[model samples]
Target: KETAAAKFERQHMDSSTSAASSSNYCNQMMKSRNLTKDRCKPVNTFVHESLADVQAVCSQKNVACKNGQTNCYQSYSTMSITDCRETGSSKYPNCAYKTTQANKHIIVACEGNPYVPVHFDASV
Candidate 1:
């Protein structure tokens, strides 16, 4: 089964080498990651850390999910990430985004025995 965790990685993880992200990086990445399917996602983030490292946060520090679920966890450390916000003028199937890279402590929702990240909740 393609778990939600796997899909989360597909949409939110980009652990490979990242140089200075171009202004256009999110446009390509969002589309390639299947985020710009039928409509533009208002915002997104790409973590520049290995899956092993990212997944470990599932058991880090427990937190209240934004929607009030208790299954969320916060990362113990700040991580490298790129945030993409849709441009105001962007339209579907031609989504445009603005990229901002930062080091953020992530919050994510998790479930199941192995405990992996199922949803990207927020970062700070």
Candidate 2:
């Protein structure tokens, strides 16, 4: 059977955005929370996967990002996978997520002014 996550992604493919577009498109999409990736794509996207993969890439330690303002962590595991997304101005996007379980936070950070610098933590 397809995981809930796989199902969500399929349903939200259009939402699986990148942070780059023409000036006009950017003005609209990245207006309040404007951001983009290479080729002017959206700065972020959401994916369905286990938190373990993200933790492994960023490392299991809870160290502040180089900027020291935005951070994330996985505190508890919810058997069902949920959706997470980006927020804040295009220049400096910040991500905040809460799991069904409490006190279970996941720390996510990028090198600096990261384009498409996002973290996906979900389970089936």
Candidate 3:
């Protein structure tokens, strides 16, 4: 089975996508990245930075995880990301998302031996 951390890296991390130029970015990427399966992933954010840069966030100030865990960390600087949110009219299998790009401080839960991001909590 794929680890949660690895899955997060695949579905929520896209360093090569320099910017969100089209409204269809989430629609295309969410499917291409295999996030739309049995049900549409309601919301997801793709970080547009190097993997190393994101990994370094783990060393930043600690924060509380959404699940009440203490393994979360917040990025010191705002990061470039595209937030994908499913539209109300979006139905399963045909997952439609509203794409919006912005710079925001991201919060993520980290774990494992090397301590890398395993869950994307939210962006501030």
Q: What TM-score would every model get versus the actual structure?
A: 0.93, 0.21, 0.95
lDDT (Cα, tens digit) per residue for candidate 2, span 58-104: 44444445455545333343222223233343332332322121222
Arranged by TM-score, best first: 3, 1, 2
Off by over 4 Å in 3: none
Instruction: Give one digit per residue, the lDDT tens place, for model 1 in 24-89.
Output: 788889999888897999899899998999989987999899998899999999999999999988
Segments of candidate 1 deviating more than 4 angstroms? none
Provide C-alpha RMSD values for all models, in order: 1.3, 15.4, 1.0
lDDT of 3 by residue, 1-124 (tens): 9998789899889988788969889999999998997789999999999999999999997999888999999999999999999998899888899999999999998888888988999899
Error of 1 at 62 (Å): 0.6
Q: How many clashing pairs per prediction, in order?
A: 0, 25, 0
The per-residue C-alpha lDDT of model 1 at residue 85 equals 95
